[PDB]
Design a protein around this motif. Structure first.
Motif, PDB file in Angstrom:
ATOM      1  N   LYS A 116       0.851  -1.183   0.000  1.00 44.16           N
ATOM      2  CA  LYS A 116       0.000   0.000   0.000  1.00 44.16           C
ATOM      3  C   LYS A 116       0.887   1.235   0.000  1.00 44.16           C
ATOM      4  O   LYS A 116       2.107   1.149   0.148  1.00 44.16           O
ATOM      5  CB  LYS A 116      -0.961   0.054   1.191  1.00 44.16           C
ATOM      6  N   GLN A 117       0.264   2.395  -0.175  1.00 40.35           N
ATOM      7  CA  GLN A 117       0.975   3.661  -0.036  1.00 40.35           C
ATOM      8  C   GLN A 117       1.693   3.752   1.300  1.00 40.35           C
ATOM      9  O   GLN A 117       1.082   3.607   2.361  1.00 40.35           O
ATOM     10  CB  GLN A 117      -0.014   4.817  -0.178  1.00 40.35           C
ATOM     11  N   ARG A 118       3.000   3.998   1.232  1.00 34.94           N
ATOM     12  CA  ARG A 118       3.847   4.137   2.415  1.00 34.94           C
ATOM     13  C   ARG A 118       3.482   5.385   3.208  1.00 34.94           C
ATOM     14  O   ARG A 118       3.720   6.511   2.761  1.00 34.94           O
ATOM     15  CB  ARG A 118       5.321   4.152   2.029  1.00 34.94           C
ATOM     16  N   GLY A 119       2.915   5.179   4.391  1.00 33.47           N
ATOM     17  CA  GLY A 119       2.396   6.231   5.236  1.00 33.47           C
ATOM     18  C   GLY A 119       0.889   6.279   5.359  1.00 33.47           C
ATOM     19  O   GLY A 119       0.389   6.845   6.340  1.00 33.47           O
ATOM     20  N   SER A 120       0.136   5.714   4.414  1.00 35.40           N
ATOM     21  CA  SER A 120      -1.308   5.651   4.613  1.00 35.40           C
ATOM     22  C   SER A 120      -1.607   4.866   5.882  1.00 35.40           C
ATOM     23  O   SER A 120      -2.377   5.303   6.745  1.00 35.40           O
ATOM     24  CB  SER A 120      -1.985   5.010   3.404  1.00 35.40           C
ATOM     25  N   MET A 121      -0.992   3.696   5.994  1.00 39.70           N
ATOM     26  CA  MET A 121      -0.899   2.961   7.246  1.00 39.70           C
ATOM     27  C   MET A 121      -0.087   3.754   8.265  1.00 39.70           C
ATOM     28  O   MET A 121       0.893   4.419   7.920  1.00 39.70           O
ATOM     29  CB  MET A 121      -0.267   1.598   6.978  1.00 39.70           C
ATOM     30  N   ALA A 122      -0.499   3.683   9.529  1.00 41.14           N
ATOM     31  CA  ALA A 122       0.176   4.415  10.594  1.00 41.14           C
ATOM     32  C   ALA A 122      -0.042   3.699  11.918  1.00 41.14           C
ATOM     33  O   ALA A 122      -1.162   3.281  12.226  1.00 41.14           O
ATOM     34  CB  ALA A 122      -0.332   5.857  10.679  1.00 41.14           C
ATOM     35  N   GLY A 123       1.033   3.568  12.694  1.00 44.16           N
ATOM     36  CA  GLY A 123       0.966   3.023  14.033  1.00 44.16           C
ATOM     37  C   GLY A 123       1.038   1.515  14.120  1.00 44.16           C
ATOM     38  O   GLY A 123       1.079   0.977  15.234  1.00 44.16           O
ATOM     39  N   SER A 124       1.061   0.811  12.990  1.00 46.16           N
ATOM     40  CA  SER A 124       1.145  -0.649  12.972  1.00 46.16           C
ATOM     41  C   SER A 124       2.574  -1.160  13.139  1.00 46.16           C
ATOM     42  O   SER A 124       3.011  -2.049  12.407  1.00 46.16           O
ATOM     43  CB  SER A 124       0.529  -1.172  11.676  1.00 46.16           C
ATOM     44  N   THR A 125       3.325  -0.573  14.072  1.00 45.13           N
ATOM     45  CA  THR A 125       4.703  -0.955  14.408  1.00 45.13           C
ATOM     46  C   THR A 125       5.616  -1.065  13.182  1.00 45.13           C
ATOM     47  O   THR A 125       6.687  -1.673  13.254  1.00 45.13           O
ATOM     48  CB  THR A 125       4.751  -2.253  15.231  1.00 45.13           C
ATOM     49  N   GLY A 126       5.215  -0.486  12.052  1.00 46.75           N
ATOM     50  CA  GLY A 126       6.031  -0.471  10.854  1.00 46.75           C
ATOM     51  C   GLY A 126       6.273  -1.789  10.150  1.00 46.75           C
ATOM     52  O   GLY A 126       7.002  -1.801   9.154  1.00 46.75           O
ATOM     53  N   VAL A 127       5.695  -2.903  10.603  1.00 52.29           N
ATOM     54  CA  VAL A 127       6.029  -4.169   9.961  1.00 52.29           C
ATOM     55  C   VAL A 127       5.487  -4.194   8.547  1.00 52.29           C
ATOM     56  O   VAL A 127       6.002  -4.930   7.700  1.00 52.29           O
ATOM     57  CB  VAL A 127       5.516  -5.378  10.764  1.00 52.29           C
ATOM     58  N   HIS A 128       4.448  -3.415   8.273  1.00 53.08           N
ATOM     59  CA  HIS A 128       3.903  -3.319   6.928  1.00 53.08           C
ATOM     60  C   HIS A 128       4.773  -2.479   6.002  1.00 53.08           C
ATOM     61  O   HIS A 128       4.582  -2.530   4.784  1.00 53.08           O
ATOM     62  CB  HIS A 128       2.488  -2.747   6.982  1.00 53.08           C
ATOM     63  N   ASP A 129       5.706  -1.701   6.549  1.00 52.51           N
ATOM     64  CA  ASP A 129       6.490  -0.769   5.742  1.00 52.51           C
ATOM     65  C   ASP A 129       7.687  -1.439   5.077  1.00 52.51           C
ATOM     66  O   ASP A 129       7.854  -1.350   3.859  1.00 52.51           O
ATOM     67  CB  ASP A 129       6.952   0.399   6.610  1.00 52.51           C
ATOM     68  N   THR A 130       8.529  -2.120   5.852  1.00 52.70           N
ATOM     69  CA  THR A 130       9.774  -2.650   5.307  1.00 52.70           C
ATOM     70  C   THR A 130       9.557  -3.728   4.254  1.00 52.70           C
ATOM     71  O   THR A 130      10.452  -3.967   3.435  1.00 52.70           O
ATOM     72  CB  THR A 130      10.627  -3.220   6.434  1.00 52.70           C
ATOM     73  N   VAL A 131       8.377  -4.338   4.213  1.00 54.84           N
ATOM     74  CA  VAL A 131       8.041  -5.247   3.120  1.00 54.84           C
ATOM     75  C   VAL A 131       8.087  -4.519   1.781  1.00 54.84           C
ATOM     76  O   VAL A 131       8.707  -4.988   0.817  1.00 54.84           O
ATOM     77  CB  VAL A 131       6.667  -5.891   3.369  1.00 54.84           C
ATOM     78  N   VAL A 132       7.439  -3.359   1.700  1.00 55.45           N
ATOM     79  CA  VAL A 132       7.383  -2.618   0.442  1.00 55.45           C
ATOM     80  C   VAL A 132       8.774  -2.174   0.005  1.00 55.45           C
ATOM     81  O   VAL A 132       9.132  -2.296  -1.169  1.00 55.45           O
ATOM     82  CB  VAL A 132       6.436  -1.414   0.570  1.00 55.45           C
ATOM     83  N   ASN A 133       9.561  -1.604   0.918  1.00 55.14           N
ATOM     84  CA  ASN A 133      10.898  -1.165   0.528  1.00 55.14           C
ATOM     85  C   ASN A 133      11.793  -2.330   0.135  1.00 55.14           C
ATOM     86  O   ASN A 133      12.580  -2.206  -0.809  1.00 55.14           O
ATOM     87  CB  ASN A 133      11.548  -0.369   1.650  1.00 55.14           C
ATOM     88  N   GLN A 134      11.622  -3.492   0.763  1.00 51.36           N
ATOM     89  CA  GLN A 134      12.380  -4.656   0.324  1.00 51.36           C
ATOM     90  C   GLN A 134      11.981  -5.091  -1.076  1.00 51.36           C
ATOM     91  O   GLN A 134      12.846  -5.392  -1.908  1.00 51.36           O
ATOM     92  CB  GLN A 134      12.198  -5.797   1.315  1.00 51.36           C
TER      93      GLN A 134
END
Ligand SMILES: Nc1ncnc2c1ncn2[C@@H]1O[C@H](COP(=O)(O)OP(=O)(O)OP(=O)(O)O)[C@@H](O)[C@H]1O
Ligand SMILES: Nc1ncnc2c1ncn2[C@@H]1O[C@H](COP(=O)(O)OP(=O)(O)OP(=O)(O)O)[C@@H](O)[C@H]1O
Ligand SMILES: Nc1ncnc2c1ncn2[C@@H]1O[C@H](COP(=O)(O)OP(=O)(O)OP(=O)(O)O)[C@@H](O)[C@H]1O
Ligand SMILES: Nc1ncnc2c1ncn2[C@@H]1O[C@H](COP(=O)(O)OP(=O)(O)OP(=O)(O)O)[C@@H](O)[C@H]1O
Lengths: 537, 37, 40, 213, 107
Positions: free
Chosen positions: D124-142
């Protein structure tokens, strides 16, 4: 030892980076001046080298290409590449060990040989996965903070290491830890913006040269035309366009409904034509982002016809206003009002006047985007548009259908008050120093605006008339040319008796509705319509 | 009422010792053979 | 993380060293019991 | 022993034509001319549209089409895991073999196909999600790092499906990642006739269908 | 040894008739003919209505009469859990035995 720092077999052409070249010249000037110069002068001068480069910008440009090329350009130890957040590990204290493992070899080499060693390159890709703010990253575990602290302590700690080059690239710079963005760490930072016209030409030449060499490209191709047409394309899109065109050409020799076949003859005869380029421009590829992409074809669906004198007069007045606003010092703000009876083309003339003007920044604010907006959102939208307009040197804005922009309705009256006060103040205030602004307004009901006491805030008004003479009606019909000469005479014989009052937007509707009946009843039907609806001064 | 949350987790290892049981068994072994012989 | 992987493997090698030592202890105890029964 | 008539998909002549023109055309021409042209292949396909029109049927049949290794499939979010730095391990594990075979054989390597399903669950858009301990973020950048890379691959193909095409991160859709976006919609009359024809051939074969239909 | 008299549900003739015609009819006709026809089997049923009409009872009775394994039950939001990504693992679990037997025995 007399180790050089540049590959002797190097040329700026083979790097193939296109329009960056001023950015690349700046990078070289800052990053490598200290090393190119011969030793004794720098020894006397005793100037330290820079260590950290930060590249940033929107998606699809040079950045990874540029980093790969910079790594290739030097003659030294091969770079070690880190692909995003592959440092993190599930045991306690395993991340810092990994980070320090990278610099261990450079530390050892510097300690052993002293100041006469080679260069080591460490490339951090997607650096925003690591160096997020230690005051903002989630409180669920330490590891992100301890990673940031390890990196800061190691890149420029107590022990001085000055023979390493670390390159970073990102998409959202502002999150990066500011203690990392300070001289002697990541210090030179640069924006890789969207390519201009010349850069587009360069990119296209770079990707087309090889096909040119073998005479696969047909001679009719006009690269400059392509460059002019392509607006806001990035490098990635510019490559994909060419790829799509080549694919469209190559497919021509394959069969693939039954089992696949390829003609070993026409496989020798392939060429790419400009028509394939034209086709790919509309069907396959579309440019994202970009500024403009105006659908004037929806605002001006039928162009213009010069059905009489007044169209020319109006267009001349608009041109005069544009010219005046172009070169003036006393009066940097000019506002013009267009009004007239309904169905008179008030919008088309305004949009054409705007389009003939060639100001860099041209935008139209219209209610059709604002459906169901509260009394608050409209203010926000308008404020945003005018803020944008204030940036550029020259700007012209068009506000159309004022009466619908206020929610006006006659039974009360009822209207929004906040909007009207915003509109008055935004019309009054002067733009920032040395910029200039033009505002074109459109409305159907002059008297109401007069009542609300906003007519004064505009500088001048222009009257857009409608058809008044039967002769003009005949001329407009001829210019449309939907009827034969005998029908024209038949109409004339009766229409000449009396003047007519009808707006062109209604003329088109009547003509279309009339065409639907049988040939022997068209004229009569038309006449009846013109009689019944035309009753007005 | 604020929303409800979820966690990541992290693990660590333990060492253990090796040698005491055989220091014992070796000091035990090599004399009953003599006795039996 | 290849080197870290081998470091983990070294840890498991230490664990298997403990296991091997326990095994040869078990064998020594069996030999004890056999000889002690034999002497009678 | 392949042709379009056996796969049993109807009403999608144009879409399948476009996909073929833009995906497998470069790989079938005798390579020498392509070497002179010096073009690199496309490595992305995105299929979206309302529920129940054949997106998965297409992806399955394409997978059976290519003379290649068995595809690796991911039934929604099979990648998320408790421990710090485990999702990334999985995602790096997906690509491994393609990199190794590129390194050993170069241009002679075969084709490895990866099929994502419900891609919008994880990306998903990086930052639309917020507060979910970031585990959803590093997947996209990887994933973004690994597909384009500093090091390069030239022998993979990623197919993605979703019923909501807007929320996917914009950075993941520019040319060179997932390029070819097709829209699968409700059929017209002719397509309906084709579908009805396909789904009754077996019955008509044995005369189980009455002559009055 | 099933018999509709044993069910114990009253006033639901038509609904149960339709459910039976749609769901289990294609499993009782001889396999050879279903082979020639080539139709896949229905894999779902939804029951909705106001409180106290007899949904759960019907579900249980259907569960008993089928000569199959003991049904797995999910008691509303049982499956949720607080560690990221463990919530879905409980879903993936339920189908694993059906996938395994599908691979081993097929049709
Ligand atoms: N200025 C340019 N001149 C020539 N080719 C370019 C230019 N910019 C981009 N390209 C081409 O388009 C692609 C750009 O890929 P690259 O990885 O550099 O993009 P990027 O935006 O830096 O990557 P990311 O999406 O990770 O930010 C390559 O094929 C490259 O050759
Ligand atoms: N000479 C002309 N001037 C303007 N429009 C013309 C002319 N000839 C044909 N047209 C067509 O007639 C259309 C008239 O509709 P349009 O919405 O532009 O008029 P308007 O007077 O602004 O409308 P409204 O009464 O809704 O405010 C124009 O869009 C254009 O398509
Ligand atoms: N064009 C078609 N030709 C043949 N059968 C079709 C077609 N469209 C749908 N079907 C039938 O309907 C089923 C549709 O399932 P499919 O997986 O294609 O749907 P979907 O739209 O991708 O689903 P979802 O929206 O749930 O992800 C196909 O398996 C086939 O049974
Ligand atoms: N048609 C029926 N015949 C016989 N008993 C019935 C019937 N409908 C309901 N009952 C009785 O009602 C009891 C409770 O019904 P049940 O558990 O099906 O509730 P429900 O209507 O599905 O409601 P809920 O939504 O609360 O689960 C059943 O155990 C049975 O005793």
């Amino acid at each position: 030892n007399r180790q050089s720092i540049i590959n002797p077999d190097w040329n700026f052409e083979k790097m193939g980076i296109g329009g960056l070249d001023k950015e690349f010249s700046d990078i070289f000037r800052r990053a490598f001046a200290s090393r190119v110069f011969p030793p004794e002068i720098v020894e006397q001068m005793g100037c330290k080298h820079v260590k950290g480069i930060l590249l940033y910008g929107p998606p699809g440009c040079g950045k990874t290409l540029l980093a790969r090329q910079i790594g290739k350009m030097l003659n030294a130890r091969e770079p070690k590449v880190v692909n995003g957040p592959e440092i993190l590990n599930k045991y306690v204290g395993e991340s810092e060990a990994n980070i320090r493992k990278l610099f261990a070899d450079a530390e050892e080499e510097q300690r052993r040989l002293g100041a006469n060693s080679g260069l080591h390159i460490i490339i951090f890709d997607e650096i925003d996965a690591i160096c997020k703010q230690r005051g903002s990253m989630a409180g669920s575990t330490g590891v992100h903070d301890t990673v940031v602290n390890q990196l800061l302590s190691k890149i420029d700690g107590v022990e001085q290491l000055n023979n390493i080059l670390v390159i970073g690239m990102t998409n959202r710079p502002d999150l990066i830890d500011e203690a990392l963005l300070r001289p002697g760490r990541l210090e030179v930072k640069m924006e890789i913006g969207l390519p201009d016209e010349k850069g587009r030409l360069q990119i296209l030449h770079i990707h087309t040269a090889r096909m040119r060499g073998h005479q696969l490209l047909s001679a009719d191709v006009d690269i400059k035309e392509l460059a002019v047409e392509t607006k806001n394309f990035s490098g990635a899109e510019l490559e994909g366009l060419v790829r799509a065109a080549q694919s469209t050409a190559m497919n021509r020799h394959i069969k693939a409904s039954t089992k696949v076949e390829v003609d070993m003859e026409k496989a020798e005869s392939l060429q790419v034509t400009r028509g394939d380029f034209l086709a790919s421009l509309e069907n396959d590829i579309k440019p994202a982002f970009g500024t403009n992409q105006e659908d004037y074809a929806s605002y001006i669906m039928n162009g213009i016809i010069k059905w009489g004198d007044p169209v020319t007069r109006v267009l001349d007045d608009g041109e005069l206003l544009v010219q005046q606003t172009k070169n003036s010092d006393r009066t940097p703000l000019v506002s013009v009002l267009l009004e007239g009876p309904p169905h008179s083309g008030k919008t088309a003339l305004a949009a054409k006047i705007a389009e003939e003007s060639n100001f860099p920044f041209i935008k139209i604010c219209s209610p059709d985007k604002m459906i169901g907006f509260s009394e608050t959102a409209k203010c926000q939208a308008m404020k945003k548009i005018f803020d944008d307009a204030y940036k550029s040197q020259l700007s012209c804005v068009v506000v159309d259908d004022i009466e619908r922009l206020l929610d006006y309705v006659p039974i009360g009256p009822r209207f929004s008050n906040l909007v009207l006060q915003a509109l008055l103040v935004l019309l009054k205030k002067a733009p920032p120093q040395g910029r200039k602004l033009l505002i074109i307004g459109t409305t159907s009901r002059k008297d109401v605006l007069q009542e609300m006491e906003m007519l004064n805030a505009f500088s001048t008004t222009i009257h857009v008339p409608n058809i008044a003479t039967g002769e003009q009606l005949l001329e407009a019909l001829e210019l449309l040319g939907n009827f034969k000469d005998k029908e024209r005479t038949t109409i004339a014989q009766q229409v000449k008796g009396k003047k007519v009052w009808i707006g062109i937007k209604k003329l088109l509707m009547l003509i279309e509705m009339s065409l639907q009946m049988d040939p022997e009843y068209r004229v009569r039907k038309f006449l009846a319509l013109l009689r019944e609806e035309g009753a007005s001064p | 009422a604020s929303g409800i949350i979820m966690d990541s987790s992290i693990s660590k290892q333990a060492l253990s010792e090796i040698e005491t049981r055989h220091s014992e068994i070796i000091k035990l072994e090599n004399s009953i053979r003599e006795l039996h012989d | 993380m290849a080197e870290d992987a081998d470091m983990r493997n070294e840890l498991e090698e230490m664990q298997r060293r403990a296991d091997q030592l326990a095994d040869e202890s078990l064998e020594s105890t069996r030999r004890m019991l056999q000889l002690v029964e034999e002497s009678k």
